Amino acid sequence: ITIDEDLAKLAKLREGMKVEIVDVNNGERFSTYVILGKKRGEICVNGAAARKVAIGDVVIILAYASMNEDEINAHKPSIVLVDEKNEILEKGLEHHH
Amino acid sequence: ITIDEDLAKLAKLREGMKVEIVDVNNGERFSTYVILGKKRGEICVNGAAARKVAIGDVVIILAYASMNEDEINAHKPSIVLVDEKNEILEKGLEHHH
Amino acid sequence: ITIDEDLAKLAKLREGMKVEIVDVNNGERFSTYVILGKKRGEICVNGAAARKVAIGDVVIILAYASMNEDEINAHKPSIVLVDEKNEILEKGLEHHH
Amino acid sequence: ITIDEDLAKLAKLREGMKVEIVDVNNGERFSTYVILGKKRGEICVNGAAARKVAIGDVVIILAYASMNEDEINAHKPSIVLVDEKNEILEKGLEHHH
Amino acid sequence: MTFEMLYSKIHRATITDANLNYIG
Amino acid sequence: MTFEMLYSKIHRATITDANLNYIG
Amino acid sequence: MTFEMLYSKIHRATITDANLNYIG
């Protein structure tokens, strides 16, 4: 999955990082890796994964890390909300309730 | 997946922890993360995952941890059984046989 | 998945260990954990996973471990082959070619 | 999945290594392990996985590793491109853009 | 060397709500 | 750095029973 | 002992393109 490098950076995603993609439109859930893109606002699903989505679909991109007890206690997740143009609306360091 | 914080605590689930959800009604199996809820007895599936379940479905929520040999020998799993209202019926520290 | 404790031991599976089950009859692939069984030759799929198999199906049970370079070089996999009654036919410490 | 040992070596795949297979023809995505093959240009899907592919299908074979921050900064992925006969066309140490 | 082990579980809980368009 | 490696396997075993509503 | 934890996420982004035969 090619993600606008600036958007990826804000979400602390590194190139090659495995991420889980869940499609809100069709319910598909799959894993792939991040490719940093040079096109502003671009999110392009490549390869076999292209069959799991349709252009225009709304998706949630999740990145997980293996952490120990101390890391969990000090951890602050980076949650980025974007608009229809993939422009940043919000970036929080805590889950919503 | 939003889980009643008190129920989550009893199962030693931390907010943000990846868990596997398996639906007994429809057989769907998927992975998502825990969101601590403030509503008593509430278990709400959010986002794309909502398409994998129906309200009223019976599910099994599994949490795994990466352990070494010594940790495995000393490990005691926290198994929580609940009723139809998600009220605690039992909590054991060993598998059933 | 409940596995005859003696069979599990031969395959070095510990209770609670996550394993991947792949069904040769129907192609289903899923993950669950091991429950040691007291019934000779028994392999019982429990919970939601029951919907992914049929009694009589032939399956392959895989256990993976996270290893570093040195561990990989010294590692010897435990491959157990069984008959229709889940009786041990062979146990090898290397892959077949 | 049995992979020509020479091809596997070029992609730094070790026997027994878990890999993710994604089929471009049918969109199937599954995980299995590597078996080193002695047949030149051979890529054979074995067991239950055989039901997820058809001979002739184009696939992408992915290998992931768990890395820390320092390892990520120094990491160079091994990306191998092959032709229709599974002959090596290219091998790069960086992602394409 | 490590193995994924069942740490904890909630057995047969009931889904009480679903929110496809959940925000944040 | 670590990699998931095939530790052990039981090849072509037969499912002898199934219990959808297994408890605990 | 370690657990997989949600590190970061991009919520409700829009797929702008798809390339089945993407090369490299």
Add this chain to the structure above:
Amino acid sequence: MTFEMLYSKIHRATITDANLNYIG
């Protein structure tokens, strides 16, 4: 703290054979 990273890949290889009842 660790993250799963793309270590290596074989892009667009062709399946040359399939063996459903492969033994061992």
